[PDB]
Design a protein around this nucleic acid. Structure first.
Ligand SMILES: [Zn+2]
Ligand SMILES: [Zn+2]
Ligand SMILES: [Zn+2]
Lengths: 224, 60, 37, 128, 136
RNA sequence: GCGUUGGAUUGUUCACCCACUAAUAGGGAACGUGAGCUGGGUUUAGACCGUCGUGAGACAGGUUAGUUUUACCCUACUGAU
C-alpha cells in the first residue's frame, strides 16, 4: 500500500531503491526504518537485496530492471554482480549493458510489458532490452524531458508523470503504454516523480514529506 | 580485482598506474603512462605509432 | 490534468506551475522579513 | 454528506470512523479565550499575548475498543498513545486538560492529532 | 558544506578556485558560471578558496537568459579538469569544468544535464543523480 | 590554549558593501617592522587649472611627471666545527 520513509534524510526513494514484481533492490545506508518500510509490508515472495553498483548508493537510477531481468551499467564490477546473482531468483537475467548512457534507471522507464526509452540510446541497446526483458520499446520523451525514467514512474496498473505533461501528450503515452496516467507530483512538489517514489503492483513507497492529496492520487491510479 | 588495457597503445594497465580521461562525447579512455596520454593529446594515430599493439596487428 | 497536492481539489494547467492560487496566497509568502512600520 | 474514516500516516491501519468530531464552536474572542494565557508566578499576571490560530489541528473522538486495554492497564493522569501496528505517536490522553489546538477548556475526552494523521472517505474515490 | 548534501565526500583535488568561469551543464538557460565562493571552505590568510568536484558553490551567470544574470545563485560542480585520484587507484579528469545551478537545498533548477557527470558528484546529491544521463 | 578569511572602490589608517565561515574580537611591542621591500600619498626643482595679489608669487585646493645608498665589523638569532 502507501508507505512513507527516508533513506538517510532524503525523500528520493527511487534514487536509492529499485522495486519490481519479482525482487527489490536497496542500498546500504543503515536506517532500519527504511529497511522496515519494505520488509514490514513484504512477504518473502520478493527478496530484498542490499547492493551498490559501481560503489554508488544511487542504485535506483543506475539499474533499469524488470520482473524477468536486470540491467546494470558498464561500470559495475564482478563482485557486486556475483552478490546480485547469488541472492536473486533465477527467473531474471542479470545482463550488464555496455552502452553510453550510464544511468539506466534515468534513461529507461519500463514495466513488465512496455519500455519507454530515452531517444539517444544506442541502436544495439533496445534489441538487448527486448532480449533480456521480453519487452518492446518506445523511444519517445515524456514531454520534451528526455529522461523518461525519472520524470515518469510506471507500473502495469497505472502510470504517473510530471505536471508539465500536456493533455495531448498524456493521450499518446496512454495509447502506447496501454495504461492510464495522471500528471501528478510527489514529495511536497518535486516534479522528479520517477525518482521521488518507487512502486510495485501492490506496494507504493513514497518519500516522508509527501502529502495526503499526493498519496491519494498515487494509490488511486497505481492499484488500477 | 580487474586488469584493464591502455586505449592508445594496448598495454595491460595494472591498478594504481596511469590515468583515465572522460571525453565530452561521453567516451572513456585509459592511458598507461604520460607518453601514451601525451601522444593522444597531440592527435596522433595509434595505427601510425609503431610500438603499439595496433601497428603490429595492422602490419601482421 | 493535475491536483493541487496541498488542498487537493483544483485541476491546474501544464504551463509550469505549483499548488493552487489560494494555497500560494495563504501558505506561501515571498514578502517575509520586512518591518511594515 | 457521506461517512469518513481517519487513519495514520507512514503506516496503513484504520484508526477510527465517522459519527464523531464535535465542532464545539471554536471562536468566541472577547478578551481571553482567543489568547493563549500564560500566568506568571504571582499576582495572576499575564505576559504572553498570543492570538489563537484559525485552523483546527486536532481531532476529538470517543473512547475506543482498541483504547480499552490501554485505559485498563496502568492508568495514570496524562500520557501518550500510538498505533498498535506501528510506533509513531498519535497524541496523548487526559481528563483534565490538553485543550485543543484552538485552545478552549472542554469536557474530559480523548484527542487525536492531524499531524502525521490523515482522513479518507470510506466509499470509493471520485475518480477525476 | 552539508547544505542538502547526502553524505560525506573524500578530498578531491581542488580543481578550480574563485574567479573560475566554468560551463553550465543543465538547460537552465545559463551558459557559464563565475565562481565567487565555495560553501564550507576553511579560512587561511591569502588562500583563496577552491572548489572540487561535487562541491556546492555560490556563483553568478555571465552569459545568457537575462532573467538569470546579475544575481548570486548556488551551483554544484559536476565536472572538473584537474586530475584527481579515486581511492581504487585510478586518476581521471574531464575535458572541461562544468557546474549546475541548484537551490540551497540541493534541488536543481534545470531538467537535464548534458554531458557526463562524475560519480563523486552524482552520489553526494540525489537530485543530480536524477537528472544526469551519463555518469562518469 | 587555539583560531580570527576571500574580494569590489579608495594611497588610504578609517569607512563601506559582497560572500563564505565556528568566528570574521579589541589592542601593544620607538603610533612593531624602509642597510626588510614597495613608493600609491606627503614633501624640492618641470607644468596646467581655479581663487587671491599691480607684481614677483601664495594656496594646509585640484591634476600630472619626479635617483629610495652600504654590512665584510660587534652582539643577537639560525645552523656548523
Ligand atoms: Zn490549493
Ligand atoms: Zn502506524
Ligand atoms: Zn478547535
Amino acid at each position: 500500500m502507501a508507505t512513507r520513509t527516508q533513506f538517510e534524510n532524503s525523500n528520493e526513494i527511487g534514487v536509492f531503491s529499485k522495486l519490481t514484481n519479482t525482487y527489490c533492490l536497496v542500498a546500504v545506508g543503515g536506517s532500519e526504518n527504511f529497511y522496515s518500510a519494505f520488509e514490514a509490508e513484504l512477504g518473502d515472495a520478493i527478496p530484498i537485496v542490499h547492493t551498490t553498483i559501481a560503489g554508488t548508493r544511487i542504485i535506483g537510477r543506475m539499474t533499469a530492471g524488470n520482473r524477468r531481468g536486470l540491467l546494470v551499467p558498464t561500470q559495475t564490477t564482478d563482485q557486486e554482480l556475483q552478490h546480485l546473482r547469488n541472492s536473486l531468483p533465477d527467473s531474471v537475467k542479470i545482463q550488464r549493458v555496455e552502452e553510453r548512457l550510464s544511468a539506466l534507471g534515468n534513461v529507461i522507464c519500463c514495466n513488465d510489458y512496455v519500455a519507454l526509452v530515452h531517444p539517444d540510446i544506442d541502436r544495439e541497446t533496445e534489441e538487448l532490452i527486448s532480449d533480456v526483458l521480453g519487452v518492446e520499446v518506445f523511444r519517445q520523451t515524456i514531454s520534451g524531458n528526455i529522461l523518461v525514467g525519472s520524470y515518469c514512474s510506471l507500473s502495469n496498473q497505472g502510470g504517473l508523470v510530471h505536471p508539465q505533461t500536456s493533455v495531448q501528450d498524456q493521450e499518446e503515452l496512454s495509447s502506447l503504454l496501454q495504461v492510464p496516467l495522471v500528471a501528478g507530483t510527489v514529495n511536497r512538489g518535486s516534479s522528479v516523480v520517477g525518482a521521488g517514489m518507487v512502486v510495485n503492483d501492490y506496494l507504493a513507497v513514497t518519500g516522508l514529506d509527501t502529502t495526503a492529496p499526493e498519496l491519494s492520487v498515487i494509490e488511486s491510479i497505481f492499484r488500477l | 580485482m580487474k586488469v584493464e588495457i591502455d586505449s592508445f597503445s594496448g598495454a595491460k594497465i595494472y591498478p594504481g598506474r596511469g590515468t583515465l580521461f572522460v571525453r565530452g562525447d561521453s567516451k572513456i579512455f585509459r592511458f598507461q603512462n604520460s607518453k601514451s596520454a601525451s601522444l593522444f593529446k597531440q592527435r596522433k594515430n595509434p595505427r601510425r605509432i609503431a610500438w603499439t599493439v595496433l601497428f603490429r596487428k595492422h602490419h601482421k | 490534468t493535475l491536483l493541487c497536492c496541498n488542498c487537493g481539489t483544483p485541476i491546474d494547467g501544464s504551463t509550469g506551475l505549483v499548488m493552487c492560487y489560494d494555497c500560494i496566497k495563504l501558505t506561501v509568502d515571498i514578502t517575509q522579513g520586512i518591518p511594515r512600520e | 454528506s457521506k461517512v469518513t474514516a481517519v487513519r495514520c500516516k507512514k503506516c496503513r491501519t484504520k484508526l477510527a470512523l465517522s459519527t464523531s468530531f464535535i465542532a464545539h464552536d471554536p471562536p468566541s474572542k472577547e478578551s481571553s479565550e482567543g489568547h493563549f494565557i500564560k500566568r506568571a508566578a504571582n499576582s495572576h499576571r499575564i505576559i504572553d499575548i498570543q492570538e489563537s490560530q484559525a485552523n483546527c489541528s486536532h481531532f476529538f473522538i470517543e473512547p475506543l475498543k482498541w483504547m480499552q486495554p490501554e485505559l485498563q492497564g496502568k492508568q495514570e493522569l496524562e500520557g501518550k498513545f500510538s498505533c498498535p501496528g506501528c510506533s509513531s505517536k498519535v497524541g496523548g490522553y487526559n481528563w483534565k486538560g490538553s485543550r485543543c489546538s484552538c485552545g478552549k477548556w472542554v469536557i474530559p475526552a480523548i484527542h487525536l492529532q492531524t499531524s502525521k494523521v490523515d482522513q479518507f472517505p470510506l466509499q470509493s474515490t471520485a475518480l477525476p | 558544506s552539508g547544505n542538502g548534501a547526502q553524505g560525506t565526500k573524500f578530498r578531491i583535488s581542488l580543481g578550480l578556485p574563485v574567479g573560475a568561469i566554468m560551463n553550465c551543464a543543465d538547460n537552465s538557460g545559463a551558459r557559464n558560471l563565475y565562481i565567487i565562493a565555495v560553501k564550507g571552505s576553511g579560512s587561511r590568510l591569502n588562500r583563496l578558496p577552491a572548489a572540487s568536484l561535487g562541491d556546492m558553490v555560490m556563483a553568478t551567470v555571465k552569459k545568457g537568459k537575462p532573467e538569470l544574470r546579475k544575481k548570486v545563485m548556488p551551483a554544484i560542480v559536476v565536472r572538473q579538469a584537474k586530475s584527481w585520484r579515486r581511492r581504487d587507484g585510478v586518476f581521471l579528469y574531464f575535458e572541461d569544468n562544468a557546474g549546475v545551478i541548484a537551490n540551497p537545498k540541493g534541488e536543481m533548477k534545470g531538467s537535464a544535464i548534458t554531458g557526463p557527470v562524475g560519480k563523486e558528484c552524482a552520489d553526494l546529491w540525489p537530485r543530480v543523480a536524477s537528472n544526469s544521463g551519463v555518469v562518469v
